[PDB]
Nucleic acid binder design. Structure first.
Ligand SMILES: [Mg+2]
Ligand SMILES: [Mg+2]
Ligand SMILES: [Mg+2]
Ligand SMILES: [Mg+2]
Ligand SMILES: [Mg+2]
Ligand SMILES: [Mg+2]
Ligand SMILES: [Mg+2]
Ligand SMILES: [Mg+2]
Ligand SMILES: [Mg+2]
Ligand SMILES: [Mg+2]
Ligand SMILES: [Mg+2]
Ligand SMILES: [Mg+2]
Ligand SMILES: [Mg+2]
Ligand SMILES: [Mg+2]
Ligand SMILES: [Mg+2]
Ligand SMILES: [Mg+2]
Ligand SMILES: [Mg+2]
Ligand SMILES: [Mg+2]
Ligand SMILES: [Mg+2]
Ligand SMILES: [Mg+2]
Ligand SMILES: [Mg+2]
Ligand SMILES: [Mg+2]
Ligand SMILES: [Mg+2]
Ligand SMILES: [Mg+2]
Ligand SMILES: [Mg+2]
Ligand SMILES: [Mg+2]
Ligand SMILES: [Mg+2]
Ligand SMILES: [Mg+2]
Ligand SMILES: [Mg+2]
Ligand SMILES: [Mg+2]
Ligand SMILES: [Mg+2]
Ligand SMILES: [Mg+2]
Ligand SMILES: [Mg+2]
Ligand SMILES: [Mg+2]
Ligand SMILES: [Mg+2]
Ligand SMILES: [Mg+2]
Ligand SMILES: [Mg+2]
Ligand SMILES: [Mg+2]
Ligand SMILES: [Mg+2]
Ligand SMILES: [Mg+2]
Ligand SMILES: [Mg+2]
Ligand SMILES: [Mg+2]
Ligand SMILES: [Mg+2]
Ligand SMILES: [Mg+2]
Ligand SMILES: [Mg+2]
Ligand SMILES: [Mg+2]
Ligand SMILES: [Mg+2]
Ligand SMILES: [Mg+2]
Ligand SMILES: [Mg+2]
Ligand SMILES: [Mg+2]
Ligand SMILES: [Zn+2]
Lengths: 59, 157, 208, 105
RNA sequence: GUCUACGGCCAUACCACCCUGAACGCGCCCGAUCUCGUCUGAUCUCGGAAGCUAAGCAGGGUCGGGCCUGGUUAGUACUUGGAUGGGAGACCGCCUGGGAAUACCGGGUGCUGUAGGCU
RNA sequence: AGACUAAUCGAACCAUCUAGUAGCUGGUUCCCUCCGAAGUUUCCCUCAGGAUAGCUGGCGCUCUCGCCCACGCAGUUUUAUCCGGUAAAGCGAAUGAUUAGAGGUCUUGGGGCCGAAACGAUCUCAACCUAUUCUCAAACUUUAAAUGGGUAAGAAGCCCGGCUCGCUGGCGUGGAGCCGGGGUGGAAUGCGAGUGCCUAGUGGGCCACUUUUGGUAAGCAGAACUGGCGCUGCGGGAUGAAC
RNA sequence: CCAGUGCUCUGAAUGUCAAAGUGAAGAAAUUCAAUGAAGCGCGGGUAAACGGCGGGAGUAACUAUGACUCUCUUAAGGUAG
RNA sequence: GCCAGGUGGGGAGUUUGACUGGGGCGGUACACCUGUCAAACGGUAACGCAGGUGUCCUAAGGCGAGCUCAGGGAGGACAGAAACCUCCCGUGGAGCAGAAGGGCAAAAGCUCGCUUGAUCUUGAUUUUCAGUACGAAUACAGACCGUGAAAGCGGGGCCUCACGAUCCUUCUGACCUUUUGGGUUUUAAGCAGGAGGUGUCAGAAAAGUUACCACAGGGAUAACUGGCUUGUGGCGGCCAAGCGUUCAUAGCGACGUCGCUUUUUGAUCCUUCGAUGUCGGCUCUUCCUAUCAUUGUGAAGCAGAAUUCGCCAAGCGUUGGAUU
RNA sequence: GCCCGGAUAGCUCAGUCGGUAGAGCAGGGGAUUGAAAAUCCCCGUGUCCUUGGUUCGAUUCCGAGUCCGGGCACCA
């Protein structure tokens, strides 16, 4: 029952069939894993963009 | 069967080099890490809290998260079939800036200023890098003196 | 004690006698200099040594029988006390025997196939010294006829190059007498301490 | 190991550090008429023999010494548990050691 | 030209041995009632100036040792790619590019930022 | 004697349940056109099998090129910039093996003689120290290549201006976020890219240049990198799976 | 040779021991205790029951071999033949 | 008759791990660490090598502050190879619980002073990875704190291992949910987080023999041949210290080294498991030469005699028996 | 060739419990006997097999060998 154990012979040729797809470009990076106190500032900063300013900034 | 554990090939990689066993030089902490920066990862044997892992030594990633005294990076690590975007949490000592963008951002500043002057006097600039062309038809000098003759050496053991 | 034909080509990484191997017995050789060990520098000007040619191993016992036959011809033909022969190849490379017939097939196969140690051998590059013999200037045919009786006893094939240097000091024999007497070089037993002129000035005042 | 009788640790009723008594966890007597005891006994009564597998192959020698903590400070009295790592020997409240002392067997 | 307080690079700035050190300053020093600490005011703390650069420290020197930097060592040692190239093998030559390391030799021997003091 | 019990015995015969079960052997019926692999990961009472990824096929969908510069992508270089400790090298640099002499004299282990006879002293044999010296290391290194690994090469950028914040705070300060305005051109090279569903087969591998571990060695056993035989004929090697 | 494993004899002298039965508490389900048949545990018997049967050292006036002396040790240490 | 407790291979039903240079006996390479092998990123195998682990710690955890280590020298009542004090030098040559590797100097080490951050809870990520989990770890975040003058530092042990699912049980938590027609209470069922285990360690409940054997199969896997390899066996070659009255070599030859052979064996598993009938003898044939005798020669420590050493050489010969 | 056990006095055994060296036997000097055997008073001795790590300390706990004595070398 003796066998062969581990070989990456023909694994270079399988991986590059479809190709090493590099993710590299997308915009507005996902916002999980963020420092929460920072996020406990920024959601407040967004909700007073709407409410706090019409007349000051638009004019 | 390779004892698939953590930090196992690191007799030489987290080893501080030579004559620089000692404290971390405290400009290591006073570097300003804003978001979006491109920073490189070199492990340090001295700060045993937040060393990354052995498979991220030397890779180049991107800062996404900043805390009190560490920094989160997004890093393009490779696995079996494909290459992944991973999030590491590294303390500051195992970080340094990458001068690839610094010479790049100086490459931007020159190209902006040449663009300023191209509108100024009306001369076409060619700030875009062309590769190193084949040499020009230069004109050597051999004034009076003759070329030194070279023949090979004899063999003596 | 297996034939040395098999343990001849260098194949495995060096596996020396140290903290972790420990089981290999003593080398065949113990000593390395045979003639006038106490010799001055100026007594034996020329040197003749055996340039290795192959990239092979030498068995440790090949060293022993060679310095015997090399000693035996010098004491016959230049007499006693008229030469100095140094074996410049220390055997550290330890090899392994996987002892079997222990005669029956009812013990074990090739299962535990690591070797317990048997003896040491010595490695050889191309262009490497084996035995240097420094002699009186008159022994020039004898140094050839001494080592030719050793060349029939090492494995493989490697030649004899009567060198250009002064004895066993590394310096050129053409410049040695020109320069030892004048200044700088100071003789020291078999070797010669080379002095620089970058030392403290009481090094220079201690001479003259 | 040696862990002291008294220990000041966070209680979960009145939101503070309070002192506690480390008392030893015991298994306690199990119950007949519990859920799995009734189901195993309804399964058992019959000409079928042993149905659920009993375990014979023990390998571990150590139990995690786990700790009741009773709040000493009155009217709160919220018992809770904790764990120490695996260990062979455990005394609770005696013979803390000396450094500057000869053994003298 | 220098010096203190705080420092970044962390030996070109350490180490040994020696020569000089105006004025501030750094120091040593005289002292223990308070403050504070040890077997002891030596250390630590505490209050002052009778003395002195001998020490620290600062400068310079040593055919100095280290360190740093560049040559020689050497297009060598190894090396990606290539061959119906050699050789029984060992291993080697060639085309193609990349190319070190020590003996050994020569040269350096702190540079500074912020505030503040001396001529 | 495990014999005999209707040519049947270490449990007869007959019929049913029964077309019992099987990861195991053998077979699996018309042509043509297109596309075309795997023996690897992890876990399993897993090792002659599956599960899962990988690999394969099919069916679509969302777009762009048809006209002094495109968009996007990559088993490639180029230009920058960090990372490594293998070859080689070194041990008069650490650690660790290690050969041989000369100088120097505190140190006891031994003798030659002064001998009541005394560290009162003569030449020492050995060790010690200094400066040399031969040779080495998969589980040692100061040094340190070739090949290599990551990232970067702009409009997602860059600048100016202004508001928000419950976080930060001497500072209208730190930093994110939001709003409006202004200039497309930022190495070479090649290409049409992007994305979702379902799913067969596979899960016994083998040989060769160089690099390699166990062996004395093997048409042996185990690998790394790449190509191939397998899956593939043809021309050469008389003939042959791989040259 | 009664150590072992077996069979067997006898004892409330004495540790264990399940139902039923009784007592105490609980509104009751239930919870607890006391009492304790056979068997086990404890004591004896048996090997024409299974079967079991040692190793060192010193030692005699040629040297030798060892009656003898010693020691560890077992349930017992292979006697007749 | 019925219930309970003993005995019960007399009778019944099942189980007899896996990896393995065939199996078995052995060993754990079955989970997990460290150095290497690994061919300078990461990854990378063998019953490849060296080693460890299933623990220990109320301080060896935490914070502050003080101090600096092994080792050597010169000194000093009894004191010496070793007591104690003192001075000097002392870059890690000591120490940090134990395997090693890294890391460490007004410190991660030593001593001391207060201490329980080894506590409460929701995510995110790193590791192994299928990009699932346990385990472990890092950054945070909301609490309650410790220590410190303070900045800070700490949610265990300086880091890389030191541990464990469902179902069941047990315990704690809310002045919690459901207890089935509505209620009151006991019991039970749940939600959340701690334990009691699966070491074949991603988790079966488990002994043996078959020569009386049976079926499914395998040359994926032995024993016979044949092949590759030739250690071992067998045969030769080179060098010359010696031996040989003198004489290295007529005849031998130590120490060394280079080969051949497939009649021993060993090692390997490529061919054969829908079979290739596997010891020895007898009978008979051919061939090999590494020649025992014969034909012709060469050499001797060859006088003749007997011998021995080589050469062209397989033409011809190499018997009769007791024992197994 | 693998798997298991041990070294202590002149012999045979302890204690191996990491802080004493013990038990018997023989030898040695007494006394008892005219002389021995035996009895009584007495003592004498351990390179704790070798070597190193573990500890404050090794005779003990581990590792390493020098050897002695086991149990195994099974299916074709
Ligand atoms: Mg497989
Ligand atoms: Mg029943
Ligand atoms: Mg004073
Ligand atoms: Mg006082
Ligand atoms: Mg002064
Ligand atoms: Mg003076
Ligand atoms: Mg100077
Ligand atoms: Mg110098
Ligand atoms: Mg029978
Ligand atoms: Mg019949
Ligand atoms: Mg039958
Ligand atoms: Mg059918
Ligand atoms: Mg039917
Ligand atoms: Mg059927
Ligand atoms: Mg096709
Ligand atoms: Mg499998
Ligand atoms: Mg099949
Ligand atoms: Mg497709
Ligand atoms: Mg390496
Ligand atoms: Mg090398
Ligand atoms: Mg599949
Ligand atoms: Mg193979
Ligand atoms: Mg196939
Ligand atoms: Mg193909
Ligand atoms: Mg082909
Ligand atoms: Mg053809
Ligand atoms: Mg051919
Ligand atoms: Mg062919
Ligand atoms: Mg009995
Ligand atoms: Mg009753
Ligand atoms: Mg006798
Ligand atoms: Mg008898
Ligand atoms: Mg039965
Ligand atoms: Mg099996
Ligand atoms: Mg690597
Ligand atoms: Mg690599
Ligand atoms: Mg150390
Ligand atoms: Mg250590
Ligand atoms: Mg401290
Ligand atoms: Mg918090
Ligand atoms: Mg009801
Ligand atoms: Mg498992
Ligand atoms: Mg059976
Ligand atoms: Mg096959
Ligand atoms: Mg042979
Ligand atoms: Mg075979
Ligand atoms: Mg086969
Ligand atoms: Mg095979
Ligand atoms: Mg033993
Ligand atoms: Mg004895
Ligand atoms: Zn409370």
């Amino acid at each position: 029952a003796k066998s062969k154990n581990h070989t990456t012979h023909n694994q270079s040729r399988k991986w590059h069939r479809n190709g090493i797809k590099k993710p590299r470009s997308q915009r507005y990076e996902s916002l999980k894993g963020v420092d929460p106190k920072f996020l406990r500032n920024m959601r407040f900063a967004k909700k007073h963009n709407k409410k706090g300013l019409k007349k000051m900034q638009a004019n | 069967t390779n004892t698939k554990g953590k930090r196992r090939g690191t007799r030489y990689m987290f080893s501080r080099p030579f004559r620089k066993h000692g404290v971390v030089p405290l400009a290591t902490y006073m570097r300003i890490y804003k978001k979006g920066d491109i920073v490189d990862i070199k492990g340090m044997g001295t700060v045993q809290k937040g060393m990354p892992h052995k498979c991220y030594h030397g890779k180049t990633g991107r800062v996404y998260n900043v805390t009190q005294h560490a920094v989160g990076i997004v890093v393009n690590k490779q696995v079996k079939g494909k290459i992944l975007a991973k999030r590491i949490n590294v303390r500051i000592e195992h970080i340094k800036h990458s001068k690839s963008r610094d010479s790049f951002l100086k490459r931007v500043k020159e190209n902006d200023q040449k663009k300023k002057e191209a509108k100024e006097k009306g001369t076409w600039v060619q700030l875009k890098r062309q590769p190193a062309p084949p040499r020009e038809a230069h004109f050597v000098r051999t004034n009076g003196k003759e070329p030194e003759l070279l023949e090979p050496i004899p063999y003596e053991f | 004690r297996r034939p040395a034909r098999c343990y001849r080509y260098c194949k495995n990484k060096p596996y020396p006698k140290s903290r972790f191997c420990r089981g290999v017995p003593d080398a065949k050789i113990r000593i390395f200099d045979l003639g006038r060990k106490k010799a001055k520098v100026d007594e034996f000007p020329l040197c003749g040594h055996m340039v290795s040619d192959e990239y092979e191993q030498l068995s440790s016992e090949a060293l022993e029988a060679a310095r015997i036959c090399a000693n035996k011809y010098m004491v016959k033909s230049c007499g006693k006390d008229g030469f100095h022969i140094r074996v410049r190849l220390h055997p550290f490379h330890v090899i392994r025997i996987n002892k079997m017939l222990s005669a029956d097939r009812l013990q074990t196969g090739m299962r535990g196939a690591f070797g317990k140690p048997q003896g040491t051998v010595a490695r050889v590059h191309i262009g490497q010294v084996i035995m240097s013999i420094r002699t009186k200037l008159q022994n020039k045919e004898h140094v050839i006829e001494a080592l030719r009786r050793a060349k029939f006893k090492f494995p493989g094939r490697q030649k004899i190059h009567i060198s250009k240097k002064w004895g066993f000091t590394k310096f050129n024999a053409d410049e040695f007498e020109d320069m030892v007497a004048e200044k700088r070089l100071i003789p020291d037993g078999c070797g010669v301490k080379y002095i620089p002129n970058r030392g403290p000035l009481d090094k220079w005042r201690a001479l003259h | 190991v040696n862990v002291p009788k008294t220990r000041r640790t966070f209680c979960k009723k009145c939101g503070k550090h309070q002192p506690h008594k480390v008392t030893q966890y015991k298994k306690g007597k199990d119950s007949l008429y519990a859920q799995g005891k009734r189901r195993y006994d309804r399964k058992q009564s019959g000409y079928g023999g042993q149905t659920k597998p009993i375990f014979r192959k023990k390998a571990k020698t150590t139990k995690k010494i786990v700790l009741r903590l009773e709040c000493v400070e009155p009217n709160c009295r919220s018992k809770r548990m904790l764990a120490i790592k695996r260990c062979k020997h455990f005394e609770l409240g005696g013979d803390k050691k000396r450094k500057g002392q000869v053994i003298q067997f």
